[PDB]
């Protein structure tokens, strides 16, 4: 039956360079040569959130679409969603269009649907953003969306996450441990907003940045090219790999989930084009995971010609 | 107009000469909002005389206070285009390796770029 057809195997990769350079994706290393299926599966499994249209008016009389202004909010949703996926499903979990998915999957996705009731919907984010001094429809930067997600997570008793946003290029281990042992350890979502330069990222940070994607705890990075935010999930050689929210899709009407998965080899852009305003994220399920992450960070001192983007201090 | 545009090179050199002679244990620092930064407020003053023992961590805190910023608002202090390697680093050491030809140590503060499309 299938024998009389040409399955066009790897058609999706006709848009990817066949190099010996390993492909890193949120802490997993792949070989372009023998793991195209694995690479595509991991990328396609990630929850993808793009601009949406025709959803309930935000605040009753606000926008019914976030096209043109919700880009960083969408990138925030994607990195936080990946944290939820790791927390509820595990980093090893993979999505398949056919096979029935776990109920926890629909719960995670549901939390990002464009409706006021969902924990992390565009409605909840934009509205909570007002309290941070951001009007509905105003563009966000990395820290702002991170701060808004931390406040929204408070109400997510299902995930019961500890969200720490390290300011001033400093990660205080004492504060983090105190947070995770409060209300024995709450899975940790660590977000580090950074400004690696004025207009460009100093070459000195490049290798350190790459290594941020090579840790088991890696959630990726949010930032972008000027006027185009992206959720960076890894890299290959000198190019960052990412998911792009700049595509307007109809609000989902049931949940059919094909539109929340980017089933294509990821978009690429040279690391040289990345703007200096970013937020790096890490997920530490247990205290042991956090301790391992701390070790991962310290080991970076072994990077030749590289400089640290942030520093770990005890208190 | 930036500090360097309001005071001439020779004038700045002279400023430093006097201040260093009058306060040998203080570092003359110019701190301004990055020309590309528009979200963070501007300071009523741009010239600071900082005890040389003050570290970047403390400097970041006082400027945040001066700008009346909340702890969760993004703020970065950059020297010669880069972030502070270590926040425990004394301003005296930063001055030593990063000072301008005119004798002043320059710094600009900024938050983060925002994003959106079309």
CATH number for position B71: 3.10.20.90
Give the Cβ contact number of residue A154 at 10 Å.
11
Tell me if B117 and A72 make a contact (CB, 8 A cut-off). Answer: no
The dihedral of CA A114, A179, A141, A294: what is its sign? Answer: negative
Alpha helices in A181-286 (DSSP H): 203-211
Q: Is the distance from CB of A233 to CB of A43 less than 8 angstroms?
A: yes
Q: Is the distance from CB of A213 to CB of A30 less than 8 angstroms?
A: no
- B interface with A, Cβ–Cβ below 8 Å: 34, 36, 57, 60, 71-76, 78, 81-88, 108, 110-118
Tell me the sheet residues that pair with B66: none
Helix then strand then coil, in percent of chain A rounded to 5, is: 35, 20, 45
Distance CA A193, CA B112 (A): 9
b/e code B20-56 from CB counts within 10 Å (16+ = b): eeeeeebbbbbbbbbeebeebeeeeeeebebebebbb
- Tally of domains within chain B: 1
- Angle between helix A122-130 and helix A142-153 axes, rounded to 10 deg: 100
Q: Is the distance from CB of A314 to CB of A173 less than 8 angstroms?
A: yes
- Residue B101, classified by CB atoms within 10 Å of its CB into exposed (0-12), middle (13-18) or buried (19+), is exposed
Experimental method: X-ray
Q: Is the distance from CB of A136 to CB of A146 less than 8 angstroms?
A: no
- Give the closest of B34, B87, B111 to A170, CB-based: B87
Tokens, residue A29: 């290393």
Distance CA A257, CA A102 (A): 13
Distance CA A281, CA A82 (A): 10
Q: Which residue, among A248, A249, A212, has the nearest Cα to A232 in the 3D structure?
A: A212
Tokens, residue A50: 């793009």
3-state DSSP call for residue A130? helix
Q: Is the distance from CB of A33 to CB of A107 less than 8 angstroms?
A: no
- Tally of domains within chain A: 1
Distance CA B49, CA A67 (A): 48
Return residues 253-312 of A near B (CB < 8 Å): 275-277, 307-309, 311
Tell me if A140 and B74 make a contact (CB, 8 A cut-off). Answer: no
Distance CA A28, CA A218 (A): 9
* DSSP 8-state assignment for residue B55: B
Alpha helices in A103-141 (DSSP H): 103-110, 122-130
Extended beta strands in B1-118, E state: 26-33, 47-51, 76-78, 105-110
C-alpha dist (Å) from residue B95 to A107, B29, B82: 54, 9, 14
Give the Cβ contact number of residue A227 at 10 Å.
15
Find the closest chain A residue to B85 by CA distance. Answer: A308
Q: Which residue, among A191, A87, A116, A177, has the nearest Cα to A148 in the 3D structure?
A: A191
Distance CA A309, CA A20 (A): 28
Return residues 68-97 of A near B (CB < 8 Å): 68-72, 75
Q: Which residue, among A267, A220, A246, A210, has the nearest Cα to A16 in the 3D structure?
A: A267
B contacts of A196 (beta carbons < 8 Å): 82-83
Give the mutation candidate from A131, A198, A307 for the B interface (greatest B CB count, under 10 A).
A198
Expressed in Å, this structure's resolution amounts to 1.9
Q: Tell me the residue range of the domain where A290 lies.
A: 1-315
Can you list the pairs that B57-64 forms with residues at least 24 positions away whose Cβ atoms lie under 8 Å?
Answer: B57/A168, B57/A170, B57/B87, B57/B88, B59/B91, B60/A168, B60/B84, B60/B87, B63/B31, B63/B109
The values of phi and psi at residue A296, to 5°, are: -55, -45
Tell me if B72 and A226 make a contact (CB, 8 A cut-off). Answer: no
- Give the closest of A194, A227, A311 to B116, CB-based: A227
Residues contacting B109, CB < 8 A, separation 6+:
B31, B32, B33, B34, B37, B40, B63, B67, B75, B76, B77, B78
The values of phi and psi at residue A4, to 5°, are: -90, 5
Distance CA A24, CA A41 (A): 13
Tell me if A68 and B116 make a contact (CB, 8 A cut-off). Answer: yes
- Residue A56, classified by CB atoms within 10 Å of its CB into exposed (0-12), middle (13-18) or buried (19+), is middle
Q: Which residue, among B15, B49, B46, B53, has the nearest Cα to B109 in the 3D structure?
A: B46
Tokens, residue B43: 């300071």
Tell me if A71 and B57 make a contact (CB, 8 A cut-off). Answer: no
Q: Tell me the residue range of the domain where B21 lies.
A: 1-118
Tell me the sheet residues that pair with A240: A235, A269
A contacts of B81 (beta carbons < 8 Å): 197-198, 202
């Amino acid at each position: 039956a299938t024998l009389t057809y040409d399955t066009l195997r790897f058609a999706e990769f006709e848009d990817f360079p066949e190099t010996s350079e390993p492909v890193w994706i949120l802490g997993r290393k792949y070989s372009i040569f023998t793991e195209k299926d694995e690479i595509l599966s991991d990328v396609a499994s990630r929850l993808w959130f793009t601009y949406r249209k025709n959803f309930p008016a935000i605040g009753g009389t606000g926008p019914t679409s976030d096209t043109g202004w919700g880009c960083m909010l969408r990138c925030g949703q994607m990195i936080f969603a990946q944290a939820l996926v790791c927390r509820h499903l595990g980093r090893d979990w993979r999505w398949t269009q056919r096979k029935r998915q776990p109920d926890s999957y629909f719960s995670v996705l549901n939390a990002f649907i464009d409706r006021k009731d969902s924990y992390y919907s565009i409605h909840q984010i934009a509205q909570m953003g007002v309290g941070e001094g951001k009007s509905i429809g105003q563009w966000y930067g990395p820290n702002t969306v991170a701060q808004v997600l931390k406040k929204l997570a408070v109400f997510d008793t299902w995930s019961s996450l500890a969200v720490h946003i390290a300011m001033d290029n400093t990660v205080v281990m004492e504060e983090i441990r105190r947070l995770c042992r409060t209300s024995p350890w709450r899975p940790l979502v660590l977000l580090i907003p950074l400004r690696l330069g004025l207009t460009d990222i100093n070459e000195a940070y490049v290798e350190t940045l790459k290594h941020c994607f090579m840790m088991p705890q890696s959630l990726g990075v949010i930032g972008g090219k000027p006027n185009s935010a992206h959720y960076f999930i890894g890299y290959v050689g000198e190019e960052l790999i990412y998911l792009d929210p700049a595509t307007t899709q109809p609000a989902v009407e049931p949940i059919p989930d094909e539109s929340f998965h980017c089933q294509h080899p990821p978009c690429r852009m040279s690391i040289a084009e990345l703007d200096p305003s970013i937020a790096v994220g890490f997920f530490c399920k247990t205290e042991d995971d956090f301790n391992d992450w701390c070790q991962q960070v310290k080991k970076l001192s072994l990077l030749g010609g590289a400089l640290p983007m942030f520093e770990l201090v005890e208190q | 107009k930036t500090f360097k545009q309001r005071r001439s090179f020779e004038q700045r050199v002279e400023d430093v000469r006097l201040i260093r002679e009058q306060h040998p244990t203080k570092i003359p620092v110019i701190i301004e909002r990055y020309k590309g930064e528009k979200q963070l407020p501007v300071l009523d003053k741009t010239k600071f005389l900082v005890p040389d023992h003050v570290n970047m961590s403390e400097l970041i805190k006082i400027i945040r206070r001066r700008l009346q910023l909340n702890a969760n608002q993004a703020f970065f202090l950059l020297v010669n285009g880069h972030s502070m390697v270590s926040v425990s680093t004394p301003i005296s050491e930063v001055y030593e390796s990063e000072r301008d030809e005119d004798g002043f140590l320059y710094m600009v503060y900024a938050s983060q770029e925002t994003f959106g499309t079309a």
